A paper describes a structure:
The disease arises from the misfolding and aggregation of monoclonal antibody light chains (LCs).
The second patient (FOR010) also showed major cardiac involvement and fibrils were purified from the cardiac tissue which became available to us due to heart transplantation. In the case of the FOR010 fibril protein, it was not possible to determine the sequence of the precursor LC by cDNA sequencing and its amino acid sequence as well as its posttranslational modifications (PTMs) were determined here at the protein level using MS. Analysis of the isolated fibrils with platinum side shadowing and scanning electron microscopy (SEM) shows that FOR010 amyloid fibrils are left-hand twisted, similar to FOR005 fibrils. The swirl of the key is right-handed in the FOR005 and FOR103 fibril proteins when oriented as shown in Fig. 3b, and left-handed in the FOR010 fibril protein.
Numbering used by the authors:
A (entry chain C), B (entry chain B), C (entry chain A), D (entry chain D), E (entry chain E), F (entry chain F): 13 to 49, 61 to 106
């Protein structure tokens, strides 16, 4: 029995608040599963931002708090009652 | 029994609030599953933003909190009562 | 028994609030499953935005909180009562 | 029984508050699973930001606090009652 | 029984507050699992930032406090009651 | 029984507050698991920052305080009641 498991809960950036400009170049997010085997530019853009009044009375955030049961072959997830 | 499992709950950015300009270049999000085997530009754009009054009394956020049961071959998910 | 499983709950960006301009170049979101085997531009656009009064008394958000049972061959999902 | 497990709860940056400009080049986030085996530029952009009034009375944040049960072959997750 | 386990709770930077400009070049975040086996530039960008009024009465942050049970072969996670 | 375990709770920088400019070059964060076996530049950028009023009455931070049970072969995590 051979198996190759990759569990990633978030491949990304996790924020409660972002004010401003975000220049982002993230070419690859592609899982390549193989059993037998970027000149992109962000250029000359103008970004003008002004936040004068902001009130954020927010409640709690729950990001990437997983409860999974992952693997290969026999996987029993959650409150599996087995007899 | 061979198997190759990739479980990703979010491949993306997770935010409660974003104010502003987002320049984003994310070419690849394609899982390639193979058993036997970008000159794009964002350029010269003008972005003018002004938020004067903002009130955000928001409630809680639950992002990417999975409960899955993933794998290959035998997978029993949730409260599977087995006898 | 061989099998190749990719489970992705979100391939995308997950937000409660976005105010502003979003320049987005995401060429590929295509799962390619093969057993035997972008000069696009966003340019010169003008974006003028002004939010003066905003009140957002919102309730809770539940994003990408999956409960799936995924795999190959034998998959028993949810509260499968088996005897 | 051979197996190769990679569990990553967050591959990304985790913040409660970000004010400002973010130049980000993150080419690779692609798990490559193989049993037998970037000239991109952010250039000349202008970013003008001003936050005058900000009040953020926010509640608690729970980022990347996973409860998973990951692996290969036999995986029993959560409060599995086994007899 | 051979197995190779890598458990990383955060591969990223974890902050409660960030004010300013972030130039970031992080090419590789790709777990490569193999059983048998960057000229990118951020250049000439102008970043102007001014935060005059900021009040942040925030609540507690819980970052990367995992409770997982990870490994290869037999993995029993959480309060598994076994008899 | 052979196994090779790497448990890293944070591969990243952990801060409560950051004011200023961050030039960051972190090429590699990729766990390479193999059983049988960067000319990037940040150059000429201008960063202007001014924080005049800042008040941060924040609550406690809990960063990288894990409770995991990691390994290879037999792993029993949390308050596993075994008989």
């Amino acid at each position: 029995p051979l198996g190759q498991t990759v569990r990633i809960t978030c491949q990304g950036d996790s924020l409660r608040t972002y004010y401003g400009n975000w220049y982002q170049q993230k070419p690859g997010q592609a899982p390549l599963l193989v059993i037998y085997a970027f000149s992109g530019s962000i250029s000359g853009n103008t970004a003008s931002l002004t936040i004068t009044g902001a009130q954020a009375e927010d409640e709690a955030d729950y990001f990437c708090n997983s409860r999974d049961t992952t693997g290969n072959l026999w996987v029993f997830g959650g409150g599996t009652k087995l007899t």
